[PDB]
């Protein structure tokens, strides 16, 4: 038990703070330096687990080791002395770079930083799959962790004198959140008139019992298993886009379709709902044009008219009529149009906000109201 | 020709389906694969090609070969049995991170997935220059196709039992799409009395008649030949946006010139086009230093009152008077300022909101029209 | 929560729902970069670049030891009561 | 083909809990459809339990709610009955069967074999 | 909930000839209903749904009709496999209630 003294430190982040402290209990003693540094010099392996009964092993890791021996001391008796250093030199000059962009300046904060085994990769001989080995990490899971770069090391100590690193890496445990779900979001297009409209909504979406969250899949692997998230990835929805997964279907914005854009049908309970005014719906089974009227912005084709259908060359088929026959416009509120340009936003924002500030006086004016 | 069921599938994509039943078509029969497997078996070195009848050649490409023919195998007389196997033993764990790192869990749905040559080139060797050639990839549109990862390949055949990949790669036929031109822009500086200001465009513009539309030139390489780009780089553009560039100068955004900013002076039809108010405008035929009265905003510098004109450091023979003298503050109309930092949007965007509500009851109360 | 049948009329339909799980760390190991190399049987064939190594590394490892050693010094235990 | 089937236990004592699991083989039950169950009593009377959706959405009959709950399982493809306080009433033929997600369509297109609980 | 009355209870006739059953719901459920088979031994089997659409593979005798609380099943050409338990099922609202029931007897 050891209390944070306070008084030497200046402003200070609870990550710091945490850290700090945590660096106490992972820090080995002096004489447990002391132990590996006498150690570390009768190493001769790349890769080498050091065993002490007064506490668990330390795998001890040589980034040039390899080519010393694999490739250096089989040739002394062939190469010149001049061109052994030469050569060995190279491989120095090119691990330093390593090392520098690593633990260097761009590293700001030693003490706060969780360094990914992947981002090791190079400082630990090239690879990491006998570095995994070594250290017992395996497992079902292995794949999933390691994609989300879930195995990180700390820097506990630092030793100028006998030139090594000590870090802590930890391997992960999996912990399932009660009353959380995450739903993946697919979307198709549909015609206004002419014009081909697309809903914006978050591709990923999670749900914790009435609330409605965004979702950040940076750090998330969708692994049949289940879904593993390295950081916690659920950060607030606005409540506007709150309502539009509710059903509102006024709050969520349209907006228009790209050039690229090969989302016109999908398959949903064995029917398709398709964009047939954007695409060409034909009836395979009797070789008829499955057809949209201006007034439908939807059409969902099932076995019940069409059993075979072909739409952009493709035959499909489908079965019970799950959904209904298509969505009308007169009977769905849709939203406002919108644009997702960085220079769009821009635009209409500084076009809104001048609008505002021509009508402050009117505004402010609440007893108009009042006076009438 | 062959039909979709979709019965045994649950929701899919456009993408999924039409890849999906494209496999059948590039998938070979299981004669084939039996005969490819006995010639990979003899197979020795890195790139060869299968010849057969039944089809076109298949290219056989492996990874670590080059390796064990110029290194492994020639130094087999002096170096021990366990050092071959360690050198061998390295490489081997090299490749399977790349081949770990490609077709890993990080790609969720290997049916839809396309795989530019580039991706593929530790996977073929380290190189894929000379897969390039045995493929009979070439002309003068090579290097731009290239560049524009334009060259994909599509998963065909995976076999665990004899442990291959089957790829189905395509060069790229370019075609001109008819009525759209793409316009780069470029902009200077302009001084309102002592405030230098910006107009936010975008960088390329595309034009299809009537219609203006964003240009996305993440895909797109700008060769001397032309524009060669591999998806379609056309989305829509806001309205008010388009009313800009249409000729609407109220409805263009400007923004403050940043720090770095040097782009104060541009020379077009022989002409220069510069912010005197900023720079340091001097005629170097006669010594006088042009000046920006702050009724004006921009200067526009031909031969027909100064031949040669020095701008910051550098003089530059200007031409025939190309254009007006000066741009008139009280005879143009400007639009109004912004700022596009994502953290100024946020706080511009919910002041507006927050004053909008305040009027709630007013806004929605809209009779005193009808009353007055 | 979702209204699924409202979203379907807008085109969008959901392709996935599964459980959330995220990562906690319990045990830690200690892994150790030994920077400088084993040269015995190099026969002071590398003494020239060894030396060059050593002061490159120096440059880049003493600040990270002053700053560990600047914060375990400011942890005290404790003295309560 | 969709094929589904049950498996629990025959006798349960009163006022105990029930459990049963509908395993269903040639598709997969994440991704898409609502799965339900359907009890038959002694009598030619069935009777609609609940459900629960691919999109993990559940509903459940409004007079048996209280004591009733449904769950699913991704890694072995089955989805579970929850029922409680059971009481000699219970008994009947449970069936899980398939319907689709979304009104007025909410018709069942296969079925389970069957299995009875007696109390 | 909707109540859903199915007669008759049980039904004789002989193969080759044209049976009607008639199943009727207490308030208006539009066209939505669905028509099953029960048979020992298999499992249950969908015929008909919203009302008069025929589920393929569903052989062409199988007739649906009516619409709102007025549902009507007919079945002509009897064979010896259509002797079997016959149930309406409403599919329009929650709660999902089923249909009394009727039974075939050869005669």
């Known amino acids: 038990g050891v209390v944070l003294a306070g008084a030497a430190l200046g402003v200070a982040t609870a990550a710091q703070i945490t850290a700090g402290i945590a660096l106490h209990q992972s820090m080995l003693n002096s004489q447990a330096i002391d132990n590996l540094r006498a150690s570390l010099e009768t190493t001769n392996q790349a890769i080498e687990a050091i065993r002490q009964a007064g506490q668990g092993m330390i795998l001890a890791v040589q980034g040039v080791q390899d080519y010393i021996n694999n490739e250096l001391i089989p040739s002394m008796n062939q190469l010149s002395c001049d061109l052994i250093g030469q050569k060995l030199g190279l491989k120095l000059l090119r691990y330093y770079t390593e090392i520098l962009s690593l633990f260097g300046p761009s590293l700001r904060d030693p003490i706060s930083a969780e360094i990914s085994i992947q981002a090791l990769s190079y400082a630990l001989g090239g690879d990491i799959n006998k570095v995994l080995e070594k250290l017992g990490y395996s497992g079902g899971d292995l794949l999933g962790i390691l994609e989300s770069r879930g195995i990180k090391a700390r820097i506990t100590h630092v030793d100028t004198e006998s030139y090594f690193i000590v870090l802590s890496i930890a391997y992960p445990t999996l912990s399932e959140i009660k009353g959380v779900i995450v739903h993946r979001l697919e979307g198709v297009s549909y015609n206004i008139g002419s014009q081909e409209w697309y809903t914006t909504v978050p591709k990923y979406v999670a749900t914790q019992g009435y609330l409605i969250s965004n979702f950040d899949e940076s750090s998330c692997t969708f692994m049949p298993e289940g879904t593993v998230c390295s950081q916690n990835a659920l950060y607030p929805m606005s409540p506007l886009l709150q309502e539009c997964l509710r059903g509102s279907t006024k709050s969520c914005a349209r907006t228009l379709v790209s050039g690229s854009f090969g989302n016109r049908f999908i398959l949903s309970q064995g029917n398709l709902i398709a964009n047939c005014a954007s695409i060409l719906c034909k009836c395979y089974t009797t070789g008829t044009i499955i057809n949209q009227d201006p007034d439908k912005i939807l059409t969902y084709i099932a076995a019940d008219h069409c059993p075979v259908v072909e739409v952009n060359g493709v035959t499909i088929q489908v079965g019970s009529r799950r959904y209904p026959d298509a969505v009308y416009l007169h009977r769905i509120d849709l939203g406002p149009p919108i644009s997702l340009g960085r220079l769009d936003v821009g635009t209409n924002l500084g076009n809104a906000i001048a609008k505002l500030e021509d009508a402050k006086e009117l505004l402010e004016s609440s007893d108009q109201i009042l006076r009438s | 020709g062959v039909v979709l069921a979709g019965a045994a599938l649950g929701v899919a994509t456009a993408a999924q389906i039409t890849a999906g039943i494209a496999l059948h078509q590039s998938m070979l029969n299981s004669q084939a694969i039996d005969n490819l497997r006995a010639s990979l078996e003899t197979t020795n070195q890195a790139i060869e090609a299968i010849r057969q009848a039944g089809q076109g050649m298949i290219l056989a490409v492996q990874g670590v070969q080059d390796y064990i023919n110029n290194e492994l195998i020639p130094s087999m007389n002096q170096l021990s049995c366990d050092l071959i196997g360690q050198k061998l033993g390295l490489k081997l764990l090299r490749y399977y991170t790349e081949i770990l790192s490609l077709f890993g869990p990080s790609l969720r749905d290997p049916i839809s997935a396309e795989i530019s040559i580039q991706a593929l080139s530790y996977a073929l060797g380290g190189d894929i220059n000379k897969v390039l050639e045995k493929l009979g990839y070439s002309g003068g549109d090579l290097l731009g196709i290239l560049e524009s990862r334009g060259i994909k390949a599509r998963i065909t055949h995976v076999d665990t039992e004899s442990y291959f990949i089957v790829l189905s790669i395509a060069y790229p036929t370019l075609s001109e799409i008819k009525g759209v031109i793409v316009h780069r822009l470029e902009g200077v500086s302009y001084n309102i009395g002592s405030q230098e200001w910006y107009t936010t465009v975008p960088k390329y513009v595309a034009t299809q008649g009537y219609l203006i539309s964003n240009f996305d030139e993440s895909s797109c390489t700008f060769m001397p030949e032309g524009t060669v780009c591999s998806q379609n780089a056309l989305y829509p553009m806001s309205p008010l946006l388009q009313e800009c560039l249409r000729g609407s100068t109220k409805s263009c955004a400007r923004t403050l010139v940043s720090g770095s900013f040097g782009n104060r002076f541009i020379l077009s039809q022989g002409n220069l086009i510069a912010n005197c108010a900023s720079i340091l405008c001097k005629c170097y035929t006669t010594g006088t230093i042009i000046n920006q009265d702050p009724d004006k905003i921009l200067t526009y510098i031909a031969a027909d009152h100064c031949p040669v004109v020095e701008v910051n450091g550098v003089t530059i023979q200007v031409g025939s008077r190309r254009y007006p003298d000066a741009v008139y503050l009280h005879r143009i109309d400007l639009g109004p300022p912004i700022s596009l930092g994502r953290l100024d949007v946020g706080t511009n965007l919910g002041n507006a909101i927050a004053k909008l509500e305040d009027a709630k009851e007013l806004l929605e109360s809209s009779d005193q029209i009808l009353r007055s | 929560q979702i209204h699924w049948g409202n979203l379907s009329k807008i085109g969008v339909v959901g392709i996935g729902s599964a459980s959330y799980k995220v990562m906690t760390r319990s045990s830690h190991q200690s892994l150790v970069i030994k920077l400088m190399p084993n040269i015995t049987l190099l026969n002071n064939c590398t003494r020239v670049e060894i030396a060059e190594y050593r002061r490159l590394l120096r440059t880049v490892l003493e600040p990270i030891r002053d700053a560990l050693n600047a914060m375990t010094q400011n942890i005290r235990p404790v003295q309560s009561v | 083909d969709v094929q589904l089937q049950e498996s629990g236990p025959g006798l349960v004592k009163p006022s105990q809990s029930l459990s049963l699991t509908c395993t269903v083989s040639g598709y997969s039950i994440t991704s898409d459809y609502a799965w339900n169950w359907i009890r038959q009593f002694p009598g030619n009377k069935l009777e609609w339990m609940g459900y629960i959706s691919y999109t993990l959405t559940t509903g459940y009959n409004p007079s048996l709610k209280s004591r009733i709950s449904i769950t699913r399982d991704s890694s072995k493809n089955q989805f579970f009955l929850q029922l409680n306080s059971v009481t000699t009433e219970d008994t009947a033929t449970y069936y899980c069967?398939?319907?689709?997600?979304?009104?007025?369509?909410?018709?069942?297109?296969?079925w389970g074999a069957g299995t009875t609980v007696t109390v | 909930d909707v109540q859903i009355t199915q007669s008759p209870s049980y039904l004789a006739a002989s193969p080759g000839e044209t049976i009607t059953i008639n199943c009727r719901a207490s308030?208006?459920?539009?066209?939505?209903l669905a028509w099953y088979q029960e048979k020992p031994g298999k499992t249950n089997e969908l015929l008909i749904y919203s009302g008069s659409t025929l589920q393929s593979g569903i052989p062409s005798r199988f007739r649906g009709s009516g619409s709102g609380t007025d549902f009507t099943l007919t079945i002509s050409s009897l064979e010896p496999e259509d002797f079997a338990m016959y149930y309406c099922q409403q599919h329009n609202e929650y709660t999902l209630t089923f249909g009394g029931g009727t039974k075939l007897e050869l005669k």
């Open positions: 308030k208006s459920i539009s066209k939505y």
């Open positions: 069967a398939r319907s689709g997600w979304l009104l007025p369509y909410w018709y069942f297109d296969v």
